[PDB]
Structures are given as structure tokens and as C-alpha cells.
Scaffold this active site. Structure first.
Site, PDB file in Angstrom:
ATOM      1  CG  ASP A   1       6.955   6.135   6.602  1.00  0.00           C
ATOM      2  OD1 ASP A   1       6.893   7.157   7.086  1.00  0.00           O
ATOM      3  OD2 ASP A   1       7.950   5.389   6.082  1.00  0.00           O
TER       4      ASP A   1
ATOM      5  CG  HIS B   1       9.514   7.200   2.890  1.00  0.00           C
ATOM      6  ND1 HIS B   1       8.653   7.449   3.889  1.00  0.00           N
ATOM      7  CD2 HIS B   1       9.099   7.864   1.761  1.00  0.00           C
ATOM      8  CE1 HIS B   1       7.728   8.638   3.397  1.00  0.00           C
ATOM      9  NE2 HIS B   1       8.308   8.924   2.240  1.00  0.00           N
TER      10      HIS B   1
HETATM   11  O1  LIG Z   1       4.631  14.189   1.073  1.00  0.00           O
HETATM   12  C1  LIG Z   1       4.108  13.862   2.019  1.00  0.00           C
HETATM   13  C2  LIG Z   1       4.349  12.749   2.861  1.00  0.00           C
HETATM   14  O2  LIG Z   1       5.270  11.773   2.155  1.00  0.00           O
HETATM   15  C3  LIG Z   1       4.749  11.220   0.773  1.00  0.00           C
HETATM   16  O3  LIG Z   1       3.416  11.233   0.560  1.00  0.00           O
HETATM   17  C4  LIG Z   1       3.229  10.952  -0.640  1.00  0.00           C
HETATM   18  C5  LIG Z   1       1.793  11.121  -1.119  1.00  0.00           C
HETATM   19  O4  LIG Z   1       1.302  11.022  -2.430  1.00  0.00           O
HETATM   20  C6  LIG Z   1       3.778   9.837  -1.596  1.00  0.00           C
HETATM   21  O5  LIG Z   1       3.482   8.610  -1.066  1.00  0.00           O
HETATM   22  C7  LIG Z   1       5.273   9.795  -1.169  1.00  0.00           C
HETATM   23  O6  LIG Z   1       6.127   8.385  -1.628  1.00  0.00           O
HETATM   24  C8  LIG Z   1       5.593  10.374   0.316  1.00  0.00           C
HETATM   25  O7  LIG Z   1       7.018  10.313   0.573  1.00  0.00           O
HETATM   26  C9  LIG Z   1       3.543  12.412   3.892  1.00  0.00           C
HETATM   27  C10 LIG Z   1       3.730  11.090   4.841  1.00  0.00           C
HETATM   28  C11 LIG Z   1       4.898  10.358   4.823  1.00  0.00           C
HETATM   29  C12 LIG Z   1       5.066   9.255   5.530  1.00  0.00           C
HETATM   30  C13 LIG Z   1       4.203   9.064   6.590  1.00  0.00           C
HETATM   31  O8  LIG Z   1       4.337   8.252   7.589  1.00  0.00           O
HETATM   32  C14 LIG Z   1       3.020   9.956   6.592  1.00  0.00           C
HETATM   33  O9  LIG Z   1       2.184   9.647   7.522  1.00  0.00           O
HETATM   34  C15 LIG Z   1       2.882  10.861   5.838  1.00  0.00           C
HETATM   35  O10 LIG Z   1       2.797  13.220   4.644  1.00  0.00           O
HETATM   36  C16 LIG Z   1       2.264  14.356   3.820  1.00  0.00           C
HETATM   37  C17 LIG Z   1       1.586  15.261   4.395  1.00  0.00           C
HETATM   38  C18 LIG Z   1       1.075  16.429   3.794  1.00  0.00           C
HETATM   39  O11 LIG Z   1       0.350  17.248   4.322  1.00  0.00           O
HETATM   40  C19 LIG Z   1       1.786  16.734   2.670  1.00  0.00           C
HETATM   41  C20 LIG Z   1       2.774  16.131   2.064  1.00  0.00           C
HETATM   42  O12 LIG Z   1       3.434  16.394   0.805  1.00  0.00           O
HETATM   43  C21 LIG Z   1       3.125  14.906   2.404  1.00  0.00           C
END
Ligand SMILES: O=c1c(O[C@@H]2O[C@H](CO)[C@H](O)[C@H](O)[C@H]2O)c(-c2ccc(O)c(O)c2)oc2cc(O)cc(O)c12
Ligand SMILES: O=c1ccn([C@@H]2O[C@H](COP(=O)(O)OP(=O)(O)O)[C@@H](O)[C@H]2O)c(=O)[nH]1
Length: 453
Positions: free
Chosen positions: A112, A15
Site C-alpha cells: 500500500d 489492511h
Molecule cells: O479510504 C481510502 C483508502 O484507504 C484508507 O485511507 C484512509 C485515509 O484517511 C485511511 O488511511 C485508511 O486506513 C485506509 O484504509 C485509500 C488507499 C488505501 C490503500 C492504498 O494503498 C492506497 O493507495 C489508497 O484510498 C482512498 C482513495 C480515495 O479517493 C478515497 C478513499 O476513501 C480512500
């Protein structure tokens, strides 16, 4: 007129890096950027700041939370299972975020996860939820039709897209099982994972995603219709050039191989494989007989690559293969002419970096909704890569399936390989079109101006 935008990304390299790529593009257009970053991590981010007079870093002290390893600041510092504790720490930066917003007074803050909009609207600041993951992922898991089922959303429910979803692709049973269970798991301050993102979607003033109309358009349209607020596109966030040339150690070594002959494999900066799949991946690369560079953490339960290698592996592969644990300049490695193939975990940043280069793509998505959905879109819709086959229920691959996928894309006379090469060329020509990213940013900045009007 120029905008003052604050940047508050999640504490993860995947990010921080694209937020900073985008910061540079906005600063080139005259906008002032206040970039919030964990304190120690700022040193690693300076290499990506191309406009230091317009992009200023402001350090955040990552607070202590019981269970968070000492000194940790990003998901690269902690096991994936500790991510929810790091989210609690992000939540606990609220006091230093409030102070920063009152002193700096930006017009907009990109963020985020921190469902912040209550503070900003008290301060007259516009909240902008800015995703660097695929809007196809958010659309599939976090659109209102999914959230109203509450705890009645099962694995069978997640094998179908939500009502109104604009495209079709298939999940395997183990993938829908993963989405159905992990959705409910607390991610920071006792908030279930999907509830957290849905609260962000519901409470923010506007939403944005990395991407372009040509690819991400149907999903951003669906999300705009579902949430009834602007869902913008920043453009594909093409990587900016770093101020640091390629490490001479890698440049020398890669330069010893014939053009297009090397297989580069990397699964991002967060995850660790289990030993058995680490073994299958490395044996599959060896079976191809191509030189390879594998950027991998030691598997679960192991502390060094050497201890976890399959027996006799170093002795067999000699100088033709390296398995390496440290952070490398992935963007610069993918530009090197030696690289003919990229085996990728389908993180959205790595996908962009592959697409704008010439390497054939082999898709090895790890167990994460965005990786899986990126892999289906890349393999079945854009058809720019070949996906390694996993067991329907166990989610595991064989070394023969890795071998097969690499062999297909690297075989000049294999028609599937020629097909994905042609399609990749078409997608690269789109993303690098002289007016594509610029016209995306033109529209992006016009709608941000509307937001602060
Ligand atoms: O991968 C998803 C993801 O990003 C990842 O989330 C990981 C959690 O383990 C780690 O934290 C990782 O670093 C990060 O990149 C986000 C997310 C990102 C930013 C946001 O502001 C936010 O609200 C959601 O939403 C998802 C929703 C899903 O249904 C399925 C998904 O796979 C993701
Ligand atoms: O050793 C590494 C690992 C990753 N990256 C960069 O870190 C980002 C990783 O983002 P992505 O979404 O692909 O994966 P993540 O690491 O978040 O799973 C990309 O810009 C990669 O080029 C890098 O430069 N060196």
C-alpha cells in the site's frame, strides 16, 4: 512452481487482516509469504496466521515523527486526523524495507501507499499495488481524468463520475465536498492524498484488488484500460477461521437472545463519532425495541462510553443493550444466530463479513470515499441493504432515520426488507459458491506467475 511474496500493507487493522487472510490462501497453495508488520502489532496478528511454516512475520520499527503519539503503530492507535503523520512514519521505514528485500529476495512484494517500485526494480523484484478497498473508489477519485484537472477539480466535478466510468450512482453534496477538499490534503511526507495513490498506480508493475469479476469486474477493467497494466482480482478474500473461539462472555450473553433478534452495530476500528451523532445512533437503536450490541469508541471529546451516553440510557435499556468500547471478534459475532441485523460503517472488510452471513444490512457509511461508495453500491446496485438517510448538506442523521432503517429490514412483512434479504442471499450464494474464490485465486496466481516471467 511456488512464489516468494512479501507483504507490506498499510499500518491499519483493515489492511493487515485481509492481507493475512489472503496470505493464508496463498500459503495453502504452497507459496512462501514474508509478512512485514509493525513490531508490537505482530502479537495481535498471530491469531490469523494459519500456516506459520510458510508465513513468517518480520517486524518493522515504526519511526518517530513529530506529532505521532508515542508508541503508535496503526491507525487504531491514533485519531483519524493523525493518519498523515503515521504515513510519514511508513515512508520512513524505507531503510529497513530495503534491508529486508535484499536479505529475503522475494519475487513480488504486495504493498500500500509507498510510491517502493524504484527499489524493487533495482533489485529485480516485481511491485504489486494490492488494494483491499473497492476499485470503484479508486476509479472514481484517482483515474487519470481526475488527476489532470489538478487543483481545478471542484465539488461539482466530483458529483459526476470521471470520463469512461462504468457505472452510475449519486453522491450527496456534502460527500462531493468532502472528496474535493480531502483529496488535496497532505498524507505523509508532504504528498497530497490523491497524488500519493496516483503515483503508486503509475509506478507499480501491476495492480490488484480484493474482489471478483461478478462485482468488481467493471472497475478493474476500467482501471486496466486507463493505466495500461495488469489489474488483477484476488477473489473476495473470504474470512479464514481463527484459532480462537468466541469469547465466552459474549457467547453466553448473545446466547440468551432469540435467533435473529439482535442488532449488531459497529463502525470499525479507526473512527470516533461526534457526540450528537453518537446520541442519535444509540437512541435510534433503543427506539427499535430490539436487543443490540454497539461496538463504538467514546465520541470526540469523551474518554468513556458511560460519560457520553444519553441521559437515562443505561437505566432504560437494562440488559437488552450493550455499548462497548473494546476490540471484539466481529467475524465470530456476525456468525452467531442471535444477530438479525448489522448496522455497518461500510468498511470493505465489514461488508464482506456481513455479506457472507445471514444478517440484514443497514448501511451507515462514515465520511470516507470508500465507505460512501461501498454504501451506494450495496444499497443501489446490489440492493443488499438499506441506507440511513443523511442531510444533503450537513451529512447528519436523525435517530428516527436509524430506527426506520432497522425497522424496515427486521420487519418480516416489510417488502423492502424481504427484497434486501433475497438480494443478500443471492450475493452470499455467489461469494460462497464452491468454485468462486478458488477460480479467482487460480487466475490470480496464474497472472502473478506471468508477472515474474
Ligand atoms: O479510504 C481510502 C483508502 O484507504 C484508507 O485511507 C484512509 C485515509 O484517511 C485511511 O488511511 C485508511 O486506513 C485506509 O484504509 C485509500 C488507499 C488505501 C490503500 C492504498 O494503498 C492506497 O493507495 C489508497 O484510498 C482512498 C482513495 C480515495 O479517493 C478515497 C478513499 O476513501 C480512500
Ligand atoms: O472491534 C473490532 C473492530 C474491527 N474488527 C475487524 O477489523 C476489520 C475492520 O476492517 P473494515 O474495513 O471493516 O473497517 P476499519 O476498521 O478499517 O474502518 C474487519 O475485519 C473487522 O472484522 C474486529 O474484529 N473487531
Amino acid at each position: 512452481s511456488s512464489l516468494h511474496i512479501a507483504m507490506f500493507p498499510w499500518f491499519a487493522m483493515g489492511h493487515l487482516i485481509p492481507y493475512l487472510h489472503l496470505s493464508n490462501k496463498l500459503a495453502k497453495r504452497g507459496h512462501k509469504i514474508s509478512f512485514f508488520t509493525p513490531k508490537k502489532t505482530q502479537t495481535k496478528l498471530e491469531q490469523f496466521n494459519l500456516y506459520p511454516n510458510l508465513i513468517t512475520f518480520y517486524p518493522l520499527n515504526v519511526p518517530h515523527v513529530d506529532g505521532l503519539p508515542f508508541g503508535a503503530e496503526t491507525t487504531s492507535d491514533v485519531a483519524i486526523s493523525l493518519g498523515p503523520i503515521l504515513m510519514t512514519a511508513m515512508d520512513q521505514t524505507q531503510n529497513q524495507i530495503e534491508l529486508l528485500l535484499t536479505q529475503l529476495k522475494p519475487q513480488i512484494i504486495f504493498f500500500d501507499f509507498v510510491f517502493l517500485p524504484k527499489i524493487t526494480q533495482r533489485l529485480g523484484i516485481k511491485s504489486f499495488l494490492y488494494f483491499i478497498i473497492n476499485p470503484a473508489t479508486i476509479s472514481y477519485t484517482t483515474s487519470p481524468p481526475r488527476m489532470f484537472e489538478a487543483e481545478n477539480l471542484t465539488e461539482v466535478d466530483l458529483m459526476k463520475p470521471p470520463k469512461g466510468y462504468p457505472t452510475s450512482f449519486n453522491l450527496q453534496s456534502h460527500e462531493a465536498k468532502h472528496l474535493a477538499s480531502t483529496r488535496k490534503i497532505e498524507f505523509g511526507s508532504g504528498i497530497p492524498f490523491s497524488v500519493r495513490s496516483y503515483n503508486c498506480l503509475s509506478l507499480t508493475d501491476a495492480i490488484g484488488f480484493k474482489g471478483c469479476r461478478e462485482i468488481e469486474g467493471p472497475y478493474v477493467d476500467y482501471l486496466q484500460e486507463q493505466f495500461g497494466k495488469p489489474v488483477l482480482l484476488s477473489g473476495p478474500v473470504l474470512p479464514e477461521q481463527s484459532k480462537t473461539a468466541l469469547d465466552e462472555k459474549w457467547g453466553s450473553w448473545l446466547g440468551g437472545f432469540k435467533d435473529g433478534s439482535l442488532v449488531y452495530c459497529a463502525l470499525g476500528s479507526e473512527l470516533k463519532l461526534k457526540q450528537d451523532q453518537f446520541h442519535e445512533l444509540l437512541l435510534g437503536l433503543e427506539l427499535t425495541g430490539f436487543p443490540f450490541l454497539a461496538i463504538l469508541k467514546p465520541p470526540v471529546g469523551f474518554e468513556t462510553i458511560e460519560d457520553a451516553l444519553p441521559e437515562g440510557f443505561k437505566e432504560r435499556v437494562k440488559e437488552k443493550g450493550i455499548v462497548h468500547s473494546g476490540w471484539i471478534q466481529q467475524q465470530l459475532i456476525l456468525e452467531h444466530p442471535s444477530v438479525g441485523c448489522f448496522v455497518t460503517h461500510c468498511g470493505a472488510g465489514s461488508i464482506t463479513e456481513g455479506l457472507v452471513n445471514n444478517c440484514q444490512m443497514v448501511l451507515l457509511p462514515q465520511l470516507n470515499g470508500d465507505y460512501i461508495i461501498n454504501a451506494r453500491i450495496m444499497g443501489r446496485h446490489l440492493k443488499v441493504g438499506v441506507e440511513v438517510k443523511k442531510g444533503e448538506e450537513d451529512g447528519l442523521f436523525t435517530k428516527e432515520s436509524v430506527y426506520e432503517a432497522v425497522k424496515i429490514v427486521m420487519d418480516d412483512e416489510n417488502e423492502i426488507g424481504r427484497e434486501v434479504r433475497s438480494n443478500h442471499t443471492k450475493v452470499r450464494n455467489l461469494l460462497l459458491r464452491h468454485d468462486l474464490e478458488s477460480s479467482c485465486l487460480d487466475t490470480f496466481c496464474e497472472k502473478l506467475q506471468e508477472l515474474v516471467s
